[PDB]
Ligand binder design. Structure first.
Ligand SMILES: C[N+](C)(C)[C@]12C[C@H]3C[C@H](C[C@H](C3)C1)C2
Ligand SMILES: [Mg+2]
Ligand SMILES: [Mg+2]
Ligand SMILES: [Mg+2]
Length: 335
């Protein structure tokens, strides 16, 4: 059981003080945008506790920056679940819907009266880029493109009905998990700009990749029950079981080891970051932003796991949205 699985990550070093204020803003935001309705959808959304995910996952965010984190997560989760139904078995249709969203990334604003997912994403994206450094905008725009474009490949895999090999699983799963977007968001919400010289060091590139893998793999373990019965194939536990011809328990144990090896690698490289900044001759302010970036990555890993142990999303989904029907109460994404 997930209640008996722990990945060795520390508890969150801090929780953003803006949790309760953001809870109020974000509840109004999802309702105003039409992303979440009234009744079952609202009770189901509330049970996820998106504000606590934002406050635990992004403890550096304050005020309106935490609101952006919660709203961004709300979009990610509501959009994700729209594919838990016929859309997720229709790759060509999924690719067309995701092309609509990708157009918003690259300038084509949806216009008045767009669907709730398009309108919500356009609002998150506009708030994200306002005052952001152009290097951040360019990188994050390509991250969003990968996220949207990957969804149809998860649908292809569902039709195939076998997990991919490890390399192909990582290519699809890193995309559908939102790639580096949670870290780009945390950087933006902390108000920092990572100097490119540090950002592209081998240490920080490996650490960034490791942190994103850690959260999606921790999710794969905790979300397997609601995913397996829907025919989902891009889950690390299923990938290992398929590749190794092992038992479920052996696959879960191996999945935990894949998380642990990445945590160990992250922390080994983190010890080199002060010296790296000195070799590059970064200014004191630049080193401060790098130090915050390190904490943003550490907090995303520990904060995501802290959230997923207390949310009702993973324990609740199989009972309120059984696999015999769609994984949502309301369609909000026109296809
Ligand atoms: C993109 N969604 C919302 C599915 C996730 C965002 C964050 C990173 C992945 C795992 C969970 C936390 C869920 C993906
Ligand atoms: Mg998904
Ligand atoms: Mg999902
Ligand atoms: Mg999952």
């Amino acid at each position: 059981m997930p209640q008996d699985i722990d990945f060795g990550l520390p508890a969150p070093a801090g929780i953003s003080p803006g949790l309760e204020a953001t809870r109020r803003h974000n509840l109004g935001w999802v309702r105003r945008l039409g992303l979440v309705g009234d009744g079952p959808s609202l009770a189901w959304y509330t049970s996820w506790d998106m504000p606590r995910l934002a406050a635990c996952g992004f403890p550096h965010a304050r005020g309106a920056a935490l609101d952006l984190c919660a709203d961004a997560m709300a979009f990610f989760f509501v959009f994700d679940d729209q594919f838990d139904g016929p859309l997720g078995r229709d790759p060509a249709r999924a690719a067309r819907v995701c092309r609509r969203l990708t157009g918003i990334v690259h300038g084509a604003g949806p216009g008045p009266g767009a669907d709730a997912c398009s309108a919500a994403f356009a609002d998150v994206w506009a708030r994200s880029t306002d005052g952001a450094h152009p290097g951040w905008v360019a990188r994050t725009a390509h991250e969003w493109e990968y996220y949207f474009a990957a969804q149809a490949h998860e649908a292809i895999n569902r039709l195939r009905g076998t997990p991919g090999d490890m390399e192909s699983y990582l290519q699809v799963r890193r995309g559908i998990a939102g790639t580096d977007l949670p870290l780009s968001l945390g950087e933006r919400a902390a108000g920092i700009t990572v100097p490119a010289a540090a950002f592209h060091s081998p240490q920080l590139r490996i650490m960034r990749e490791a942190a994103i893998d850690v959260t999606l793999m921790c999710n794969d373990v905790y979300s397997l029950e609601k995913e397996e019965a829907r025919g989902d194939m891009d889950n690390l536990v299923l990938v290992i079981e398929h590749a190794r011809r092992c038992t479920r328990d052996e696959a879960v144990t191996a999945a935990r080891g894949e998380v642990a090896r990445r945590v160990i690698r992250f922390e080994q490289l983190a010890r080199e970051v002060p010296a790296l900044c000195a070799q590059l001759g970064l200014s004191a302010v630049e080193r401060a932003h790098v130090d915050t970036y390190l904490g943003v990555m550490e907090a995303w890993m520990s904060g995501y796991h802290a959230w997923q142990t207390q949310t009702r999303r993973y324990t609740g989904a199989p009972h309120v949205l059984p696999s015999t029907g769609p994984g949502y109460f309301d369609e909000v994404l026109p296809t």
